[PDB]
Design a protein around this ligand. Structure first.
Ligand SMILES: O=C(O)[C@@H]1O[C@@H](O[C@H]2[C@H](O)[C@H](O)[C@H](O[C@H]3[C@H](O)[C@H](O)[C@H](O[C@H]4[C@H](O)[C@H](O)[C@H](O[C@H]5[C@H](O)[C@H](O)[C@H](O[C@H]6[C@H](O)[C@H](O)[C@H](O[C@H]7[C@H](O)[C@H](O)[C@H](O[C@H]8[C@H](O)[C@H](O)[C@H](O[C@H]9[C@H](O)[C@H](O)[C@H](O)O[C@H]9C(=O)O)O[C@H]8C(=O)O)O[C@H]7C(=O)O)O[C@H]6C(=O)O)O[C@H]5C(=O)O)O[C@H]4C(=O)O)O[C@H]3C(=O)O)O[C@H]2C(=O)O)[C@@H](O)[C@@H](O)[C@@H]1O
Length: 490
């Protein structure tokens, strides 16, 4: 009954979404395979509004990276846009095509609103769709080619090649930003002024002022014995960030461009778009601290369930004991001085200010994000779970669209955060003077961070999440508190 021919599809009057990352729902109906609506988390939806009641019996949808993974979804319809009928369930896209694919049901239904309800894909927890449309196969083309068969794949070959040549060019443009050949020359206390005993633990700093003081080195305002600093320039030309070890940081290290005490005592981190990066697994530069519970004793390794890292108290007994501590609290107070104003729809204005990471994934990445056109910014966080097959975002002040108007956190405004892990429960709190705390509690029982062999460390500072803006654009934050604690086994 399906024909190769038919009249034009209806144009939706409105496309909306429960959420997105800046790649908004307007990108579903633009017929461009080069744009996408993206959102993360089971049950997130995009909705086509047709303006009045119409008749449909199918949808056509093209999928972001549709040839590398399969998306999972339902489709639902409504007359009122309050009561929802499910017409297609546990659909799985083909994984073989980036062009349109049809998902058809019998019989037709009457609806004004049609909704895509996403359940991630087979690789990660993202719902990412390049085109969606409700279709009536009595009047509209429902061609054969939208059923993905070997010959549809062969027919995609020219499109695939052109996409890949554009990927390749962007990858080359990104590579040009990564020389690390910039910034004034660093001065390392361990090479210049201090004999550093890298086979011992640093002393515990005492007499740290309650409020950071201008003209103090960061290690005089904060306990810098349990961090190393990742710096985005590469002055010894090994292709890697020039890292500042705990013995250096704890003896007064500062870099006057990117890591230094401000004129009110705050610790400033600045991160440009440009720089070398920590590995091929990220696209982004960072100017960020990485927790080192060995605290300067370099006989202990950086990586491993060992005396440099902690574990959740819900981990197996062997891990609980082999770790330097169990559970953890990071508490920080800071203000954002500047957010990138250039870059693409999901990256502009976005960076990370706190993390907990294991070898591969992040139990949390705390973002701040300000859009160049909004007068305040958003703070929200991600919990990645189940070996990175799942990802959920939780708002704190606004959400990942960062469309907060006047209601978010302004450049210059001081606020606090707390990341608190006790076993398989993470509590994240956002504090602001004269306002109520905002709290999100994350149940991690099924997150798989207690399975055994996973080691944890905190991070704080500014990890850029923008590789697409101008090379010299930057994001910058000033911290006034950085307090880390852990429990001990028995
Ligand atoms: O539809 C869609 O799908 C679309 O998706 C959406 O996009 C989102 C998706 O999620 C998407 O997947 C993507 O996600 C990516 C994002 O990037 C995201 O933020 C996230 O990023 C994470 C990842 O984890 C990522 O991998 C990276 O991790 C960082 C991590 O933060 C840490 O930095 C960590 O650091 C490591 C690392 O190896 C690093 O290089 C470094 O190694 C150093 C260091 O100095 C160590 O101390 C150690 O030192 C040793 C050395 O040998 C040293 O020389 C010395 O040696 C000693 C020693 O004794 C020796 O043996 C010898 O005798 O000599 C001595 C001497 O010489 O001194 O000391 C040693 C020692 O052990 O002490 O190792 C060195 C070294 O160089 O090896 O530090 C380690 C460390 O652990 O500290 O890892 C890095 C890393 O890169 O791995 O970033 C994070 C992050 O910041 O977030 O995940 C990404 C992903 O791809 O999964 O993007 C998302 C978004 O964009 O949002 C949307 O696009 C949507 O629109 C679409 O729909």
């Amino acid at each position: 009954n399906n024909k190769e021919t038919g009249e034009a599809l209806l144009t939706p009057v409105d496309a909306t979404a429960s959420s997105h990352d800046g790649n908004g729902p307007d990108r579903l109906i633009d017929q461009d395979l080069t744009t996408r609506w993206s959102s993360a988390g089971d049950g997130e939806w995009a909705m086509l509004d047709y303006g009045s009641v119409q008749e449909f019996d199918a949808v056509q949808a093209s999928f972001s990276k549709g040839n590398e993974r399969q998306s999972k979804f339902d489709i639902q319809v409504s007359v009122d846009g309050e009561t929802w009928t499910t017409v297609l369930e546990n659909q799985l896209s083909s994984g073989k095509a980036i062009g349109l694919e049809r998902f058809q049901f019998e019989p037709a239904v009457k609806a004004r609103y049609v909704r895509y309800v996403g359940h991630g894909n087979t690789k990660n927890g993202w719902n990412s769709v390049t085109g969606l449309a409700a279709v009536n196969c009595s009047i509209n083309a429902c061609p054969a080619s939208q059923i993905i068969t070997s010959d549809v794949v062969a027919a995609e070959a020219v499109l695939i090649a052109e996409m890949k040549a554009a990927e390749k060019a962007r990858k080359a443009a990104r590579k040009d930003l990564r020389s690390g050949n910039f910034g004034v020359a660093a001065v390392y206390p361990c090479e210049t002024s201090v004999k550093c005993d890298t086979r011992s633990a640093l002393p515990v700093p005492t007499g740290l002022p309650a409020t950071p003081v201008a003209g103090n080195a960061p290690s005089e305002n904060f306990d810098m014995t349990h961090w190393y600093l990742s710096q985005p320039f590469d002055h010894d030309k090994n292709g890697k960030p020039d890292d500042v070890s705990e013995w250096n940081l704890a003896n007064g290290y500062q870099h006057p461009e990117i890591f230094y005490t401000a004129d009110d005592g705050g610790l400033v981190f600045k991160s440009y778009v440009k720089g070398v990066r920590t590995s091929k697994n990220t696209k982004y530069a960072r100017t960020e601290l990485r927790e080192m519970m060995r605290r300067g004793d370099q006989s202990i390794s950086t990586k491993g369930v060992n005396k440099n890292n902690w574990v959740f108290s819900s981990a197996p007994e062997a891990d609980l004991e082999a770790a330097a501590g169990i559970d953890g609290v990071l508490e920080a107070t800071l203000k954002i001085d500047h957010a990138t104003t250039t870059g693409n729809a999901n990256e502009v204005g976005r960076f990370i200010i706190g993390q907990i990471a294991d070898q591969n994934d992040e139990p949390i990445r705390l973002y701040y994000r300000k859009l160049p056109n909004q007068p305040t910014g958003a703070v929200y966080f991600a919990h990645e779970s189940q070996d990175a097959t799942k990802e959920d975002f939780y708002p704190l002040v606004g959400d990942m669209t960062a469309e907060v108007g006047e209601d978010g956190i302004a450049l210059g405004e001081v606020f606090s955060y707390r990341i608190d892990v006790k076993g398989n429960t993470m509590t994240v709190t956002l504090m602001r003077e004269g306002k109520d705390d905002v709290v999100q509690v994350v149940d991690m029982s099924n997150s798989g961070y207690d399975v055994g062999g996973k080691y944890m460390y905190f991070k704080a500072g500014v990890a850029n999440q923008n590789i697409s803006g101008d090379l010299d654009d930057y994001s910058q934050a000033t911290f006034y508190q950085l307090d880390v604690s852990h429990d001990q086994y028995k």
